[PDB]
Amino acid sequence: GDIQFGKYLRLSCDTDSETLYELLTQHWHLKTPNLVISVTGGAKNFALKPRMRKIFSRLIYIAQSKGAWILTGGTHYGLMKYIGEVVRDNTISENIVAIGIAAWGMVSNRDTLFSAQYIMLYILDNNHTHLLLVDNGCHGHPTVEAKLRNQLEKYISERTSQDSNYGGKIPIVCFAQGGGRETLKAINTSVKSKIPCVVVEGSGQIADVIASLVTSSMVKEKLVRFLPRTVSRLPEEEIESWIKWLKEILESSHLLTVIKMEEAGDEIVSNAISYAL
Amino acid sequence: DLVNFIQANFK
Amino acid sequence: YTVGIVQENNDQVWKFQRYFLVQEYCNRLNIPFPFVVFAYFYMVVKKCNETLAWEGVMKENYLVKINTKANDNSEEMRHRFR
Amino acid sequence: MVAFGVARQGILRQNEQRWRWIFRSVIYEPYLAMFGQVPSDVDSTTYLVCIYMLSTNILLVNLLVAMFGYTVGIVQENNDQVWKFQRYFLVQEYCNRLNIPFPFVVFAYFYMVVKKC
Amino acid sequence: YKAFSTNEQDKDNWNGQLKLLLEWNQLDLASDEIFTNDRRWESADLQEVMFTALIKDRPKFVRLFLENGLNLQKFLTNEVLTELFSTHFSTLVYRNLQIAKNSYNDALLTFVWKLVANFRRSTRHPLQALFIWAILQNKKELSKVIWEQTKGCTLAALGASKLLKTLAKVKNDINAAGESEELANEYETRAVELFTECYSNDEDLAEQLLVYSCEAWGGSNCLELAVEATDQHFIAQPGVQNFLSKQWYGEISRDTKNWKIILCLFIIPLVGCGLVKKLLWYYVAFFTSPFVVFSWNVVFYIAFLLLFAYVLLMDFHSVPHTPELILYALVFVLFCDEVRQWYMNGVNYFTDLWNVMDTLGLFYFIAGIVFRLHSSNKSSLYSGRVIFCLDYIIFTLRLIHIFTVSRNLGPKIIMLQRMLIDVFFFLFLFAVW
Amino acid sequence: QPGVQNFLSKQWYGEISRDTKNWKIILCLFIIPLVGCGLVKK
Ligand SMILES: CCCCCCCC(=O)OC[C@H](COP(=O)(O)O[C@@H]1[C@H](O)[C@H](O)[C@@H](OP(=O)(O)O)[C@H](OP(=O)(O)O)[C@H]1O)OC(=O)CCCCCCC
Ligand SMILES: [Ca+2]
């Protein structure tokens, strides 16, 4: 049903990747010359620090300029609320789409639907226009939206469009400012696909760990100061996997790119994205 | 129409 | 003293004063004075959100602009060398 | 001055009915103002306005002060560049003009006219 | 801070560390040590510390709390604001406010005084009230921080500038007045620059913002506030002047040249003019334009002066008759115009100079009518017609004022305004001698 | 300078408090017994 205080759909995780893109392309809106994927959910709180106050603001303007889609979690809590925030202000000030994919079972309130309206267990940001709720298992605590997101990204990457000036397939860029939890797994899975080229922001997180890196012993010293509570509470069975995953990312450093907090020069985001592509 | 299409997406 | 006071600029004063003439006619009915008697009598008979968001949006850029000039005032990139 | 001239005419008498002398009478008020000849002394005998006349003079004098003020204001700014620009026209005019004095440029004008036709 | 954290007794309690780091002004250390940590902020823990930060004049910590996340509207309860104003409002500044209201009372100052008095006994617009609280005590940085959160930025800046100027006019103490004036200058510059940016971005939206009557910030829009405070710089800029021009010509499009419009005006039916189905719509738009109204009024005024001259000078005798009746109707409408302006603002009418010129002229006309109407004595008519003559002559001096619209001579005529006072003093001295 | 000029003003008005406006003082002066003026038992 539609959402208004705006469309939300509920689909199975096993659902085919193509059908999603076909529906979006055929009548809702025109073909996308660009796409951006943002990692989020590692920390519910998002700190509006001076560094983050500029990069995403420039990125959203770039997306509007290129007509790029933005793929975020879609919840009011976190970075996606500000990605939504800024998107709405751009419209207030040619059209920018914002797709948010979350877990259907992870949603506290679900209303069947003309269009059912709910006004304020995860809450959903109003700014994002389209919301996709994956339901592989009902009331399933574990998050499954990441798998469907990865499948959709893989399909879109293989999609071929003659438009624009990018050979064959349309461009894809993954922005990695959030750290740890689903962020590292998402980066690993995306890098597994050749087409995606990840980008790491300058914030203080495990993304900062990856930025600093560019065996297990070499990287063990890293992330200790950045995430003390995370490592201390994390069991050894989880810490070992966390440090194992970093090797896969560092194996292929050519695809990834680093945005350094230092450069005060404007449009750093554009330079980073263009270089990565 | 659109209503028929939407039903297919969920399956 | 006429010389003394004519030396200083006076155009800005007229620019401010021009407001009153424009304002007076907007309130006044758009009919010539000889026929505005009827308008006066008619008037006497009766007696007896989004823009704010755009402004906020405009203010955001203003703050960024005021800060970036001060940031760029520096002629050395001291933090790079440090 | 014209307005206060008609005011003075009204002061002089009450009745006006001569279409020929109406133009002449008001014309004399400027005449009185220019060379300072006024019948006001006789008019008062003929029969608040006295203060009004002084107020009129006070209002008038500010007028003459006005040119002094704005003449100063406009003479302050630089003017040499304006003359430097304007000097171009004088030079340009003579180049097109035949290099013969005006008393004898009639022949040159006639000669030029012949070619056109 | 270290000797405290190392002890570990209160290490689990971030609140104590934050409070200690707030007592001593160290924003950089506190932000890195506490805020960067991945700890939940329910926005209820921060309220207690935010209150003290507000009291103790810690603006940087207030900004840091706002950045890290705190709903100011939720925090600003009706209970907090009254305490804010009553105990933490300096008794010295309340003293200044009482004096300013008594001496230099103003349209916005009375509203501000009422608002302050309201929060001394017990929609809401709490943010604007807190901004006023900060501004009244010459807290520069705090006022700067709060101005950003305010919904109406340019309007709030203009209102703050006006209020600070009114406070500066007070003479109870020099330092506070000087500080208030200095802050008012900065707020005026902000109100100018922000509006310039807005107008550069969009014409129509900026114009809409200008005329936007507020929801009782001071009961007026930014244009009226700028006029009242005599913010000559704000009203003298390309954007505001262009907005005023777009109104002076009204429906008529600009840059059509004066002679083209005047030729149509003197010749009524013409169709060769450009302006921003039904042919009557063109004529309606042309007629309703204020510029055409001003020109037509000038022409009618010239005709009225000629008729007044003819009646006064020529064939003014005994019963007034039709020439009088027709003449006097116009002067009566002239009185009703001044009555309308009095109704609009009597005080501003008294302030105006041309208005006083108008009043004295209409009074003289009534005085002239008085003598002839009653006709008790034959000689009284002859003695009184001079009053009518003086009425005629005075009206012409007012006629002169219309020459300011062209602006080719407007600076000169406006100069003569302040010239006349100097001349009158400087001539009264000579007259006494 | 502001300080010296303010000191001189604080003497010119003397006991009378400033910013009371001239007309208010003059009205009392021409009318001797008035009590509606503000200045810095008996
Ligand atoms: C007839 C008796 C005596 C007449 C003398 C009376 C003299 C008198 O009253 O003003 C003359 C006026 C001249 O108009 P004028 O062209 O100078 O107006 C300005 C001028 O056009 C400038 O060029 C404009 O740009 P800028 O400023 O340069 O940047 C400016 O605004 P904008 O274009 O920028 O927006 C204009 O304001 O013409 C009238 O019709 C007025 C109605 C008078 C009614 C006359 C009816 C015949
Ligand atoms: Ca009037």
Q: What is the DSSP letter of A107?
A: B
Q: Please tell me the distance from the alpha carbon of residue A46 to that of residue A39, in angstroms, as a whole number.
A: 12
Please indicate whether chains D and A are in contact, defined as at least 3 beta carbon pairs under 8 Å: no
E166 close to ligand 1 (CB < 6 Angstrom): no
- To what resolution in angstroms was this structure determined? 3.5
Q: DSSP per residue over E293-307, as a string?
A: HHHHHHHHHHHHHHH
> Which of A93, C11, C26, C32 has the alpha carbon at shortest distance from E246?
C26
> Which of E267, E234, E261 has the alpha carbon at shortest distance from E248?
E261
Residue D21, chain E, CB below 8 Å: the answer is: no
User: Rounded to a whole number, what is the distance in Å from the CA of A188 to chain C's nearest CA?
Assistant: 32
Indicate the length of chain E as a whole number: 433
Residue of A nearest to B8 (CA): A19
Residue of D nearest to E383 (CA): D47
> Which of A84, A131, A130, A126 has the alpha carbon at shortest distance from A106?
A131
> Are the C-beta atoms of residues A121 and A139 closer than 8 Å to each other?
no
Residue of D nearest to C2 (CA): D69
Angle at which helices A52-66 and A79-92 cross, to 10°: 50
Question: Of all helices (H) and strands (E), which one includes residue A258?
Answer: strand A257-258
> Which of E329, E352, E327 has the alpha carbon at shortest distance from E341?
E352
The pair of structure tokens assigned to E317 is 């005798």
The pair of structure tokens assigned to F30 is 């021409």
Q: Please tell me the distance from the alpha carbon of residue A156 to that of residue A169, in angstroms, as a whole number.
A: 8
Q: Please tell me the distance from the alpha carbon of residue D115 to that of residue C66, in angstroms, as a whole number.
A: 70
Contact assignment for B9 to A15 by CB distance below 8 Å = yes
First to last CA, chain B: 16
Q: DSSP per residue over C11-26, as a string?
A: HHHHHHHHHHHHHHHH
Q: Please tell me the distance from the alpha carbon of residue E313 to that of residue D11, in angstroms, as a whole number.
A: 9
Q: DSSP per residue over D5-32, as a string?
A: HHHHHHHH-S----HHHHHHHHHHHHHH
Let me know if A272 is exposed, middle or buried by CB neighbors in 10 A (0-12, 13-18, 19+): buried
The pair of structure tokens assigned to C41 is 């009598």
Q: Please tell me the distance from the alpha carbon of residue E153 to that of residue E194, in angstroms, as a whole number.
A: 8
CA distances (Å), A153 to each of A27, A170, C70, E243, E355, in order? 20, 11, 42, 51, 75
Its sign, for the CA torsion E167, E169, E174, E177, is positive
Paired strand residues for A119: none
Helix, strand, coil distribution of chain A in percent, nearest 5: 40, 15, 45
Angle at which helices A206-213 and A236-251 cross, to 10°: 40
Q: Please tell me the distance from the alpha carbon of residue A87 to that of residue A130, in angstroms, as a whole number.
A: 13
**Please, which contacts does A164-168 make with residues 24 or more away whose CB atoms are closer than 8 Å?**
A164/A33, A166/A33, A166/A277
First to last CA, chain E: 81
E259 close to ligand 1 (CB < 6 Angstrom): no
CA distances (Å), E238 to each of C65, D50, E124, E196, in order? 21, 49, 35, 9
Question: Of all helices (H) and strands (E), which one includes residue F26?
Answer: helix F22-30
Its sign, for the CA torsion E352, E355, E361, E362, is negative
E403 close to ligand 1 (CB < 6 Angstrom): yes
Residue B7, chain A, CB below 8 Å: the answer is: no
Pairing of strands A98-103, A130-134: parallel
Angle at which helices E258-266 and E290-313 cross, to 10°: 60
> Are the C-beta atoms of residues A74 and A101 closer than 8 Å to each other?
yes
Q: Please tell me the distance from the alpha carbon of residue D52 to that of residue D8, in angstroms, as a whole number.
A: 11
Q: Considering only CA atoms, which residue is closest to atom 1 of ligand 1?
A: E299
Q: Please tell me the distance from the alpha carbon of residue C51 to that of residue C31, in angstroms, as a whole number.
A: 33
Q: Please tell me the distance from the alpha carbon of residue E36 to that of residue A174, in angstroms, as a whole number.
A: 24
E406 close to ligand 1 (CB < 6 Angstrom): yes
> Which of C52, A187, A17 has the alpha carbon at shortest distance from E215?
C52
Ligand nearest to the CA of E337: 2
Pairing of strands A173-176, A98-103: unpaired
> Which chains sit next to E, with 3 or more Cβ pairs under 8 A?
A, C, D, F
Paired strand residues for A134: A11, A103
Helix (H, G, I), strand (E, B) or coil at F19: coil
Q: Which residues fall within 8 angstroms of residue A188, CB to CB, at 6 or more apart?
A: A245, A248, A249
Q: Which residues fall within 8 angstroms of residue A159, CB to CB, at 6 or more apart?
A: A21, A169, A170
> Are the C-beta atoms of residues A205 and A230 closer than 8 Å to each other?
no
Q: Please tell me the distance from the alpha carbon of residue A30 to that of residue A24, in angstroms, as a whole number.
A: 8
Q: How far is the CA of E409 from the centre of ligand 1 (A)?
A: 10
Q: How far is the CA of E355 from the centre of ligand 2 (A)?
A: 6
Max intra-chain CA distance, chain D: 79
E241 close to ligand 1 (CB < 6 Angstrom): no
